[PDB]
Design a protein around this nucleic acid. Structure first.
Ligand SMILES: [Mn+2]
Ligand SMILES: [Mn+2]
Ligand SMILES: [Mn+2]
Length: 431
DNA sequence: ATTATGACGCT
DNA sequence: AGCGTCATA
């Protein structure tokens, strides 16, 4: 037992913005605040597609992926903000810029890994050691954790309100703590949670945006923790909380297991919950899911994961894409060339801003298309050199690499019609 | 006809 | 390199 690594060496947090694109629009338009509200892209087809939903609107059953016309059936007073359109397409610049606001604040506390437009991991291990340094063995007051939930508590041997339950759990947690031990993982997580309160307070003070967070010993548990008490709260998932938590946790809830692999774990092993994985040897799991996945599952079901928080605050690709669904599919050369130019002009604008802001240049242009009839997201993916930030050159180059995908006899018709265009700049070098 | 992204793994 | 998988607003 004394040699079995417990995966408690790190303190890792995940901070995720609440209903992020909705909050961006609510900051801008005070009339949308504290309302059932959603963000929609486009409009003509079924009212547009919903991509973010306020918690008030969720109460009516409104979700992402829903057509606005259908959401209005559940929630007639639903308010809608539209994604900007530029050069004929949805343009997400407002939300990318709001993201940078939050990421730059988080970066003041620790090096971050940008994991999406609205969330980042933080390795707080070093910051926790120094805060423990300056605490002088002083206990942690509940006042320092005003929005923190301790997963699994309260428990054991009155009160039916939810804030009261949070405090009860927190009280039990702090009561059990050993603040005398600067190496105690539970104490380290608790100090991590104090820092994340500070981080989240700073984000809200300086941007107007609320967020949730999870604190644990690794990225997967931090991510899971974060969702447990959204919105506007943070959750601490201790190592000790994992057996109960995982005993009823569907496998698909764990990050990376929400797709085909997770379904195969369930199918092959005849299990449902994360905790049930503990009954298989590492070699058994490797036999079914491969060396890497098998080792990962073996540790993960015990609450252990080693994936580091990467020091990367900026995306490593900048891309532009557009679907051409139904009968809007591009069937002529002039059409294909027009849209490549629109994408290329947005790409140039974003690339040029990126070079000025971030002292780097992209060196490879990736061009991707989908053809009508193909089930795959992408039908074809080709790269070429990106030597100049020039939209006409990039669009001309993109057309050159896709030129013979056209099985048309004639020059000017495009067959089979294109249902997606994608331009992506990659392979950055310092500049 | 959810769309527009973005990262990582396989071979 | 090109494809697949998984993820997130
Ligand atoms: Mn979010
Ligand atoms: Mn998110
Ligand atoms: Mn989401």
């Amino acid at each position: 037992g004394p040699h079995m690594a417990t995966g408690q060496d790190r303190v890792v947090a995940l901070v995720d913005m609440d209903c992020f694109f909705v909050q961006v629009e609510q900051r801008q338009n005070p009339h949308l605040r504290n309302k059932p509200c959603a963000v929609v892209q486009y409009k003509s087809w079924k009212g547009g597609g919903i991509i973010a939903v306020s918690y008030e609107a969720r109460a009516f059953g409104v979700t992402r992926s829903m057509w606005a016309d259908d959401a209005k059936k559940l929630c007639p007073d639903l308010l809608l903000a539209q994604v900007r359109e530029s050069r004929g397409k949805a343009n997400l610049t407002k939300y990318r810029e709001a993201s940078v606001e939050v990421m730059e604040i988080m970066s003041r506390f620790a090096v971050i890994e940008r994991a999406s437009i609205d969330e980042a991991y933080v390795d707080l291990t070093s910051a926790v050691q120094e805060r423990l340094q300056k605490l002088q063995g002083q206990p942690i007051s509940a006042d320092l954790l005003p929005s923190t939930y301790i997963e699994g508590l309260p428990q054991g041997p009155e009160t039916v309100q939810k804030e009261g339950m949070r405090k009860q759990g927190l009280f039990q947690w702090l009561d059990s703590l050993q603040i005398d031990n600067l190496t105690s993982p539970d104490l380290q997580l608790t100090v991590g949670a104090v820092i994340v309160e500070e981080m989240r307070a700073a984000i809200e003070r300086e941007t107007g945006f609320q967020c949730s967070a999870g604190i644990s010993h690794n990225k997967v548990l931090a991510k899971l923790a974060c969702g447990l008490n959204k919105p506007n709260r943070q959750t601490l998932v201790s190592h000790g909380s994992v057996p109960q938590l995982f005993s009823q946790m569907p496998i698909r809830k764990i990050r990376s297991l929400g797709g085909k692999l997770g379904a195969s774990v369930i199918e092959i092993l005849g299990i449902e919950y994360m905790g049930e994985l503990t009954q298989f040897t590492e070699s058994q799991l490797q036999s079914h899911f491969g060396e890497k996945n098998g080792s990962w599952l073996y540790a993960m079901c015990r609450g252990i994961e080693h994936d580091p928080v990467k020091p990367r605050q900026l995306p490593k690709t900048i891309g532009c894409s557009k679907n051409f669904p139904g009968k809007t599919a591009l069937a002529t050369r002039e059409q294909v060339q027009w849209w490549l130019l629109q994408l290329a002009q947005e790409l140039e604008e974003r690339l040029t801003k990126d070079r000025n802001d971030n002292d780097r240049v992209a060196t490879q242009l990736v061009v991707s298309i989908r053809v009508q009839g193909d089930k795959r997201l992408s039908s074809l993916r080709r790269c070429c050199a990106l030597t100049r930030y020039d939209a006409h050159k990039m669009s001309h180059d993109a057309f050159t690499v896709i030129k013979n995908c056209n099985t048309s006899g004639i020059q000017t018709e495009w067959s089979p019609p294109l249902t997606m265009l994608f331009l992506c700049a990659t392979k950055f070098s310092a500049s």
